[PDB]
Amino acid sequence: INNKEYRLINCNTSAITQACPKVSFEPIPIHYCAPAGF
Amino acid sequence: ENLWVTVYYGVPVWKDAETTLFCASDAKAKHNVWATHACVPTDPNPQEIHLENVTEEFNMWKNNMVEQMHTDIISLWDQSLKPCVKLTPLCVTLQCTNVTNAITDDMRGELKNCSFNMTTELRDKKQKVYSLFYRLDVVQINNKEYRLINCNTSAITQACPKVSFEPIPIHYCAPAGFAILKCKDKKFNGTGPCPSVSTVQCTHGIKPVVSTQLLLNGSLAEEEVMIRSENITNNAKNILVQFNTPVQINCTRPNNNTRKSIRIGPGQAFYATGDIIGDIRQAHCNVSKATWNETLGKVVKQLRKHFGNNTIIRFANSSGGDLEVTTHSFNCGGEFFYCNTSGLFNSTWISNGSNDSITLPCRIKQIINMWQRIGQAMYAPPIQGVIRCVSNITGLILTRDGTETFRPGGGDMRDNWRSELYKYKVVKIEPLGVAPTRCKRR
Amino acid sequence: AVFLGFLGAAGSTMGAASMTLTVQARNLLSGIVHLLKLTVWGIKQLQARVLAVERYLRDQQLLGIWGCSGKLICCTNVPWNSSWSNRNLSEIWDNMTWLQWDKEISNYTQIIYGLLEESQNQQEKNEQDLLAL
Amino acid sequence: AVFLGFLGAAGSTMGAASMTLTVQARNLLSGIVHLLKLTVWGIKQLQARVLAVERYLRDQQLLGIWGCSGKLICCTNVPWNSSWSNRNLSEIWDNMTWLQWDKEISNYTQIIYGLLEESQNQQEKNEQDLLAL
Amino acid sequence: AVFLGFLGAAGSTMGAASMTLTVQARNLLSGIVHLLKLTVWGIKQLQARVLAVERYLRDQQLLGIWGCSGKLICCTNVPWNSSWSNRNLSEIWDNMTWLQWDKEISNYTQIIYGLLEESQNQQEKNEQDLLAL
Amino acid sequence: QGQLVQSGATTTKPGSSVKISCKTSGYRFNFYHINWIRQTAGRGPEWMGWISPYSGDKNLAPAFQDRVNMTTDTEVPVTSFTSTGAAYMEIRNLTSDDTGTYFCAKGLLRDGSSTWLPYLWGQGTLLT
Ligand SMILES: *[C@@H]1O[C@H](CO)[C@@H](O[C@@H]2O[C@H](CO)[C@@H](O[C@@H]3O[C@H](CO[C@H]4O[C@H](CO[C@H]5O[C@H](CO)[C@@H](O)[C@H](O)[C@@H]5O[C@H]5O[C@H](CO)[C@@H](O)[C@H](O)[C@@H]5O)[C@@H](O)[C@H](O[C@H]5O[C@H](CO)[C@@H](O)[C@H](O)[C@@H]5O)[C@@H]4O)[C@@H](O)[C@H](O[C@H]4O[C@H](CO)[C@@H](O)[C@H](O)[C@@H]4O[C@H]4O[C@H](CO)[C@@H](O)[C@H](O)[C@@H]4O[C@H]4O[C@H](CO)[C@@H](O)[C@H](O)[C@@H]4O)[C@@H]3O)[C@H](O)[C@H]2NC(C)=O)[C@H](O)[C@H]1NC(C)=O
Ligand SMILES: *[C@@H]1O[C@H](CO)[C@@H](O[C@@H]2O[C@H](CO)[C@@H](O[C@@H]3O[C@H](CO[C@H]4O[C@H](CO)[C@@H](O)[C@H](O[C@H]5O[C@H](CO)[C@@H](O)[C@H](O)[C@@H]5O)[C@@H]4O)[C@@H](O)[C@H](O[C@H]4O[C@H](CO)[C@@H](O)[C@H](O)[C@@H]4O)[C@@H]3O)[C@H](O)[C@H]2NC(C)=O)[C@H](O)[C@H]1NC(C)=O
Ligand SMILES: COc1cnc(-c2csc(C(=O)NCCO)n2)c2[nH]cc(C(=O)C(=O)N3CCC([C@@H](C#N)c4ccccc4)CC3)c12
Ligand SMILES: *[C@@H]1O[C@H](CO)[C@@H](O[C@@H]2O[C@H](CO)[C@@H](O[C@@H]3O[C@H](CO)[C@@H](O)[C@H](O)[C@@H]3O)[C@H](O)[C@H]2NC(C)=O)[C@H](O)[C@H]1NC(C)=O
Ligand SMILES: *[C@@H]1O[C@H](CO)[C@@H](O[C@@H]2O[C@H](CO)[C@@H](O[C@@H]3O[C@H](CO)[C@@H](O)[C@H](O)[C@@H]3O)[C@H](O)[C@H]2NC(C)=O)[C@H](O)[C@H]1NC(C)=O
Ligand SMILES: *[C@@H]1O[C@H](CO)[C@@H](O[C@@H]2O[C@H](CO)[C@@H](O)[C@H](O)[C@H]2NC(C)=O)[C@H](O)[C@H]1NC(C)=O
Ligand SMILES: *[C@@H]1O[C@H](CO)[C@@H](O[C@@H]2O[C@H](CO)[C@@H](O)[C@H](O)[C@H]2NC(C)=O)[C@H](O)[C@H]1NC(C)=O
Ligand SMILES: *[C@@H]1O[C@H](CO)[C@@H](O[C@@H]2O[C@H](CO)[C@@H](O)[C@H](O)[C@H]2NC(C)=O)[C@H](O)[C@H]1NC(C)=O
Ligand SMILES: *[C@@H]1O[C@H](CO)[C@@H](O)[C@H](O)[C@H]1NC(C)=O
Ligand SMILES: *[C@@H]1O[C@H](CO)[C@@H](O)[C@H](O)[C@H]1NC(C)=O
Ligand SMILES: *[C@@H]1O[C@H](CO)[C@@H](O)[C@H](O)[C@H]1NC(C)=O
Ligand SMILES: *[C@@H]1O[C@H](CO)[C@@H](O)[C@H](O)[C@H]1NC(C)=O
Ligand SMILES: *[C@@H]1O[C@H](CO)[C@@H](O)[C@H](O)[C@H]1NC(C)=O
Ligand SMILES: *[C@@H]1O[C@H](CO)[C@@H](O)[C@H](O)[C@H]1NC(C)=O
Ligand SMILES: *[C@@H]1O[C@H](CO)[C@@H](O)[C@H](O)[C@H]1NC(C)=O
Ligand SMILES: *[C@@H]1O[C@H](CO)[C@@H](O)[C@H](O)[C@H]1NC(C)=O
Ligand SMILES: *[C@@H]1O[C@H](CO)[C@@H](O)[C@H](O)[C@H]1NC(C)=O
Ligand SMILES: *[C@@H]1O[C@H](CO)[C@@H](O)[C@H](O)[C@H]1NC(C)=O
Ligand SMILES: *[C@@H]1O[C@H](CO)[C@@H](O)[C@H](O)[C@H]1NC(C)=O
Ligand SMILES: *[C@@H]1O[C@H](CO)[C@@H](O)[C@H](O)[C@H]1NC(C)=O
Ligand SMILES: *[C@@H]1O[C@H](CO)[C@@H](O)[C@H](O)[C@H]1NC(C)=O
Ligand SMILES: *[C@@H]1O[C@H](CO)[C@@H](O)[C@H](O)[C@H]1NC(C)=O
Ligand SMILES: *[C@@H]1O[C@H](CO)[C@@H](O)[C@H](O)[C@H]1NC(C)=O
Ligand SMILES: *[C@@H]1O[C@H](CO)[C@@H](O)[C@H](O)[C@H]1NC(C)=O
Ligand SMILES: *[C@@H]1O[C@H](CO)[C@@H](O)[C@H](O)[C@H]1NC(C)=O
């Protein structure tokens, strides 16, 4: 802030939402498929 | 003599029906509240097939298209105001003063210079900010303390400033297996057997303009000037007149306003009104006194057919109600005007200018409420610069009192859509037909 | 020639309308009805899409259980009970329109749909027994 | 007469059930399944609508690639390999029900569906060559 | 035998591809496309389901108004206007592929679709008049 | 369309072994055979042999049974239906009695009875 006072980096630009800790960020193989007739 | 049933697939016979009508629009690409970017592109060849020898029954006062469009537009506004800023921190005590006094006595309180304490990006530190607010958006406490008009009745949500309030022509289309029947009768009442009938895949371009008393930017009649009500002998059914000539109106807000952004939280910004550059003038509308008198005479002539060649009809101003309905309220370049119309409806006509124009003093609101529900209100962000729009008055919404007198009004949003969907009717196709002939299988 | 257009012969005689059935048949599934965004217009259009195929197939379903699959003018073995309409042929096909005809045949439209249904079930049973030798 | 109703002859013999096929054919797409509101009941009903037409057309698709379009009882040119079921005709149509018959023919139902498929492809090729003169 | 697979004869001659049409016909509605949860993958799959049946029926609709319902190789009464393609039979079916053939017949594909349409409307009118005695 | 440009018309003397090239354009090089034809002056025109730019299978007359090497290299995709190719021709126990003009011609149809038939020819090359 300009003392030892600080703030989170995002407070002036963005609202912040913590990820629900039960979700996994580990990528899982995704297969893309076209519909019938394609 | 020897007659068997014979089945025919694709017979030209239809039945009245209610269905879901999707939207069609033309290519223009920011994003309007009407989400016309998400509509199917309209055919550059608006195909219309004329149904020779057909005579269909219409009833604009039972039409389902107006009840469907009424909900669609409201849903478009709900869809657009969901992800925008909740201004609940603004419902705080305001220390207000008149902005720049000395002009014309009680016209300085019409817009205030209000300062207030506001939340910052830090939840534990306040800021003293100020904003310019119109008088119709604030009320006193009883000292110079004020609050926003909506704080005791409704929560307020400011419109995302990247959205455009400008109406874009909407085309309504029926799904496959259904059809839209248009009434081509140039002197059609709204109900009854319309002789000339044609079918269309989609309706014409309908701009979703929500206005009061005066119908703007609408369609015009081709002959005379029709007058439509379900029970004209009943004084409690709104008279919907539709001009054939457009009487032009010029509205403007000459005050050069500045929009000041205020950070009320992380990712949240309230768009306040900075100050006024130059003169603090009055917003108003002009309409040619000559054309308005001529067009008001045509309405008198057609009103005579329902009340007698000898009777006398008179025009008076609104007899009360909410602010949106007592004035010619509409949207002009972002701001919501509320125009006094005592100068347009102040005439008595007998049984049997030319240079200047008549002006209409308009007040401006920013906290406008939702018409249907209560507890839901929108904040229109401040428009920068000078506003001026030029549009056509193509109809009216009148009211009889029970010699004769007619005053305006009409806070019902679907009366607007009736003035454009009266020609159209939704029917479903039934292509299976059985009939006798001397043809036998095998 | 003529070519009145979609429903163009709605006011013409039944016989004259009975010569332009392809004009209505092809517009029973097309029109303008590519991602599925569930906005107010997107939900509206999706219903418009499912509604068209639904109504289209219900007519083809009846057309199938009558032995008239892929036909515009099929003939049957169900005789015309004159209690349905005692009108003569000349005063039906050279006089009435399909709209007013459906208006007066409307009561018996469910009766006729049953006679065409079991006549096809029994006819296919007859054809199987004839090919059993 | 009789008229047992929808699936009314599920426990009857195959021959007796083979006389009331229209009773089941007409209920394969109708029922009770007008705006599309995406509520918990609205999403539920929309899926119920798309699911019916989907399953209905998959049966009509097989019925088409076999040359049996719009048929309830069509005959084929695929002989009955007795390894499928060595039961005799009288002990099949005057004895078994369609439920227990499908239970024992279940293994070969995919084998038979292939023989009916290419038999129709070759038959239409034969008909084209016969009309080439 | 051969059995190239789905689109396996896309590069083969038109005559050779004209012997494996069931291979493509059966995959026009199946695949992998039970509750309707409206998640990002659920909305995506629902559109994939409605899109398949929609396109499948539009082809069957044209096949119906041409009198070719449930057919893979149907013959018509529309003669071949040589302005469409002056190529000879041997240099068409033993030479070109269906892909490059559709590339050069592409302009007249809407013209031919109209000649097949009214030829079926007039043929069914002829069959009705022949059975009127 | 279709073009088949041939090599140069240089000359050698008996005992040698020359290579003749044939470069194709405007058509899928793999879809049609490549024939080699000889128009001698002291004999009627002779069919030497064809080869499959797709399957590599070759077929030459018994008069050239063990004396000629026919080779082609894989094509180059230009468009979906266009490719460039090349065909090669060699002679073993070569003399001067094999003098004349040499042509390369591609097959007629992709199937039927006249599959490999020399249909589209080159401009020819003069020899010894
Ligand atoms: C809807 O309908 C609405 C209603 O109809 C409508 O509202 C209208 O809006 C417009 C714009 O918003 C308004 O227009 C303004 O009009 C002002 C007044 O102009 C009139 O009066 C002056 C002055 O009159 C005195 O002088 C003359 C002689 O010159 C005498 O004859 C008069 O009698 C009077 O003098 C006596 O009386 C006084 C008291 O009464 C005494 O004190 C005095 O001692 C004397 O006894 C006239 O000159 C004007 O004439 C001009 O216009 C006529 C047409 O009317 C033309 O023939 C011709 O062009 C004339 O030039 C007129 O009659 C204007 O002053 C004003 O313009 C000024 O202000 C704006 C903003 O403030 C400036 O940007 C602009 O540049 C102008 O500034 C100039 O003038 C001031 C004043 O002197 C200077 O200080 C300044 O430096 C500048 O000078 C420069 O320009 C001069 C000329 O421009 C030039 O002379 C200088 O040398 C220098 O170069 C503005 O235009 C209009 O009033 C509204 N309507 C009504 C009814 O009020 C609305 O638009 C409609 N449309 C919608 C809503 O869409
Ligand atoms: C992809 O594209 C390529 C290129 O177009 C296709 O290859 C061509 O296929 C067609 C049809 O299959 C071929 O036409 C046939 O040609 C044969 C002539 O070859 C015979 O003679 C050879 C030399 O004498 C002989 O060696 C062959 O015998 C075996 O040996 C080879 C060794 O590689 C083996 O590959 C062969 O398969 C054989 O097992 C060979 O028999 C000719 O006999 C054919 O005529 C008969 O059939 C036609 C009907 O098809 C009939 O009308 C006739 O009367 C006769 O009964 C037929 O003309 C062509 O030669 C191939 N090559 C080219 C054009 O260069 C390939 O098929 C395409 N595949 C796909 C999946 O799209
Ligand atoms: C303006 O009205 C609103 C205010 N706020 C919210 C709001 C906040 S939040 C929220 C939300 O998230 N909803 C989700 C669950 O509820 N929705 C609204 N939502 C739908 C609204 C409407 O369609 C509506 O009432 N109209 C239409 C516009 C009118 C007008 C013009 N142009 C006019 C106004 C005055 C004078 C002339 C012309 C007239 C009336 C609406
Ligand atoms: C609305 O009211 C606010 C007060 O809450 C006004 O803000 C104040 O305006 C005055 C006058 O412009 C400012 O004082 C000036 O400061 C400058 C810069 O030092 C100086 O040069 C001038 O001589 C004068 O002293 C004052 O700073 C300002 N305060 C704040 C907090 O903004 C505002 O101007 C009013 N708006 C309108 C449209 O009347
Ligand atoms: C009735 O219809 C007319 C025309 O369709 C509308 O006029 C349009 O008004 C908008 C905003 O008022 C104009 O946009 C503005 O353009 C100017 C110039 O580029 C720009 O400076 C502004 O910031 C704004 O973008 C638009 O150009 C104008 N169109 C025409 C043809 O004049 C009118 O607003 C409609 N009225 C109602 C009540 O719907
Ligand atoms: C309204 O006020 C703004 C400034 O508050 C004006 O914007 C100026 O426009 C001129 C054009 O001549 C530019 O040279 C300036 O740089 C602008 N200033 C700013 C701060 O943007 C605007 O022109 C005014 N509008 C009217 C109609 O008077
Ligand atoms: C409303 O404004 C418009 C445009 O500002 C006026 O129309 C102009 O009228 C003059 C008359 O001399 C013409 O020269 C212009 O070409 C017109 N402009 C346009 C864009 O058409 C109109 O007169 C005004 N009406 C009122 C009642 O104020
Ligand atoms: C106001 O009304 C006039 C007259 O109805 C409109 O002007 C017409 O615009 C159409 C646009 O398709 C033209 O084809 C006509 O030739 C115009 N006629 C005249 C007399 O100008 C005008 O567009 C309307 N303006 C608004 C804003 O609604
Ligand atoms: C937010 O504050 C940081 C402090 O370092 C600054 O770098 C950044 O530019 C600020 N963001 C905005 C949008 O002003
Ligand atoms: C604003 O001005 C009006 C008119 O002069 C006056 O009555 C009112 O008290 C003023 N309000 C404030 C807060 O100055
Ligand atoms: C802001 O809060 C302070 C208290 O710290 C109070 O004295 C002041 O009046 C408030 N300002 C406004 C504009 O309400
Ligand atoms: C909210 O306060 C205003 C103050 O003028 C009052 O008019 C209005 O009736 C109040 N609303 C309710 C619901 O009490
Ligand atoms: C509307 O016009 C029709 C035309 O015949 C007429 O029958 C009907 O009475 C009229 N209704 C009103 C309210 O004017
Ligand atoms: C119209 O209103 C009058 C009285 O206001 C009533 O007598 C009459 O029955 C009404 N007409 C209809 C059609 O409702
Ligand atoms: C009323 O007067 C008009 C002429 O303006 C005339 O055409 C009409 O017939 C008259 N009607 C009655 C009822 O007097
Ligand atoms: C109508 O006009 C009268 C006459 O002056 C006025 O007192 C009244 O306030 C006006 N009403 C409206 C809503 O403008
Ligand atoms: C409208 O204007 C008239 C005079 O023009 C005035 O008497 C009336 O009070 C005004 N209405 C309102 C609501 O201010
Ligand atoms: C006509 O139908 C009635 C019942 O709908 C039946 O009783 C009668 O026998 C039928 N007559 C003929 C001639 O079909
Ligand atoms: C159909 O049934 C209704 C029932 O009231 C009757 O009024 C009508 O006359 C009947 N029409 C025919 C053609 O049987
Ligand atoms: C029966 O099927 C088997 C394989 O499923 C086959 O090997 C056998 O030849 C078939 N026999 C007859 C008589 O069809
Ligand atoms: C079908 O296959 C299963 C596999 O275990 C076998 O047990 C059963 O007997 C088979 N049934 C017939 C009728 O082939
Ligand atoms: C071929 O088509 C053209 C127009 O597409 C037509 O004018 C001509 O008569 C046709 N010729 C034949 C032989 O079909
Ligand atoms: C085979 O088709 C191609 C396609 O362009 C064509 O160029 C070629 O001439 C055809 N072959 C014969 C023998 O006509
Ligand atoms: C199809 O039309 C285009 C239009 O430019 C033309 O270039 C092309 O040659 C046409 N092809 C045929 C086969 O007619
Ligand atoms: C033809 O020449 C190539 C060049 O390497 C060689 O590999 C091949 O063996 C030759 N063919 C014969 C039959 O010798």
Description of the structure:
Chain B: It comes from Human immunodeficiency virus type 1 (HIV-1). Chain B: It is a peripheral membrane protein; Single-pass type I membrane protein. Chain B: GO terms for molecular function: identical protein binding; structural molecule activity. Chain B: This is Envelope glycoprotein gp160. Chain B: Residues 3-105, 109-442 form the Human immunodeficiency virus 1 envelope glycoprotein Gp120 domain. This is part of a larger assembly, with two copies of chain A, three copies of chain C (133 residues) and one copy of chain F (128 residues). Chain A has 38 residues and is low in regular secondary structure. Chain A is 0% helix and 0% strand. Chain A has no helix or strand. Chain A is elongated and about 65 Å long. The termini of chain A are far apart. Helices cover 51% and strands 5% of the residues of chain C. Chain C has helices at residues 14-17, 21-25, 40-65, 90-93, 98-104, 109-130; one strand at residues 73-79. Chain C has one domain. With 133 residues, chain C is mainly α. Chain C contains six helices and one strand; from the N terminus they run αααβααα. Chain F is mainly beta and 128 residues long. In chain F, strands 3, 4, 5, 8, 9 and 10 form a six-stranded antiparallel sheet that branches. A four-stranded antiparallel sheet of chain F has the order 1-2-7-6, with no helix packed on it. The complex binds a molecule of 10 linked components (NAG-NAG-BMA-MAN-MAN-MAN-MAN-MAN-...), a molecule of 6 linked components (NAG-NAG-BMA-MAN-MAN-MAN), the ligand COc1cnc(-c2csc(C(=O)NCCO)n2)c2[nH]cc(C(=O)C(=O)N3CCC([C@@H](C#N)c4ccccc4)CC3)c12, a molecule of 3 linked components (NAG-NAG-BMA) (2 copies), a molecule of 2 linked components (NAG-NAG) (3 copies) and 2-acetamido-2-deoxy-beta-D-glucopyranose (NAG) (17 copies). A molecule of 3 linked components (NAG-NAG-BMA) binds at residues 166-167, 209, 216-217, 330, 332-333, 389-391 of chain B.
